[PDB]
Enzyme design. Structure first.
Site, PDB file in Angstrom:
ATOM      1  CG  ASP A 134       0.927  -0.519  -1.321  1.00 55.10           C
ATOM      2  OD1 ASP A 134       0.250  -0.060  -2.266  1.00 55.10           O
ATOM      3  OD2 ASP A 134       2.175  -0.496  -1.297  1.00 55.10           O
ATOM      4  CB  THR A 135      -4.613  -0.945  -3.770  1.00 53.96           C
ATOM      5  OG1 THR A 135      -4.199   0.389  -4.098  1.00 53.96           O
ATOM      6  CG2 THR A 135      -5.693  -0.894  -2.699  1.00 53.96           C
ATOM      7  N   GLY A 136      -1.271  -1.234  -4.368  1.00 53.51           N
ATOM      8  CA  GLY A 136      -0.251  -1.372  -5.382  1.00 53.51           C
ATOM      9  C   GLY A 136       0.760  -2.464  -5.127  1.00 53.51           C
TER      10      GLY A 136
END
Ligand SMILES: CC(C)CN(C[C@@H](O)[C@H](Cc1ccccc1)NC(=O)O[C@H]1CO[C@H]2OCC[C@H]21)S(=O)(=O)c1ccc(CO)cc1
Lengths: 99, 99
Positions: free
Chosen positions: A25-27
């Protein structure tokens, strides 16, 4: 490897002697894992997103293996619906976005 | 380009003729933007995050440009803490994870 985003980027991880499925998850600033009984000390924390906040337990210097890549850092444990690998660990395995 | 994850992967987007900052979020199935005025019809929907479920307006087939890469897909509008670009649009611009 290269992971396309047609489906959820789920990968196998190893933490505290257990294999789990987790979302790359880059967020997510930090890593958040489903409820598990990790030993050692911890400090309370509140993290927010869509829907509001959840209470988590912050463990420091936890070793996690992500697709054979080792990484050690902060791991939050709480009532998250999904295991989430955040940027604090994604940087340690050399993960990048490419388009 | 190639984007490392030591900082939030924030990019400038253009939707409805207005510029905004948004987060490339491989952990989001859908794209969710903060409250704004968009042309066209919509339907009320529900989406769940880490903290619970929120009410959003679903706009279909909306034009949206991300780092100069054009996409046309579903855009959800509601009380999200951050403008997030989900996999429904990340796939359109050819975004992948690499490590
Ligand atoms: C909102 C964003 C800026 C921040 N989050 C990351 C997101 O990737 C989140 C991950 C996710 C949560 C629950 C279920 C599936 C995926 N996805 C998400 O909300 O997506 C929505 C819209 O599309 C749908 O797809 C999946 C759900 C729907 S966070 O979870 O709240 C968060 C906050 C602080 C920390 C520690 O720093 C770690 C993680």
């Amino acid at each position: 490897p290269q992971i396309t985003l047609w489906k959820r980027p789920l990968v196998t991880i190893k933490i505290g002697g257990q294999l789990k499925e987790a979302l790359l998850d880059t967020g997510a600033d930090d890593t958040v894992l489903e409820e598990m009984n990790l030993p050692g000390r911890w400090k309370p924390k509140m993290i927010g997103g869509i829907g509001g906040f959840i209470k988590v337990r912050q463990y420091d210097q936890i070793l996690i293996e992500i697709c054979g890549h080792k990484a050690i850092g902060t791991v939050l444990v709480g009532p998250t619906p999904v295991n989430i690998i955040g940027r604090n660990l994604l940087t340690q395995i050399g993960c990048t976005l490419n388009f």
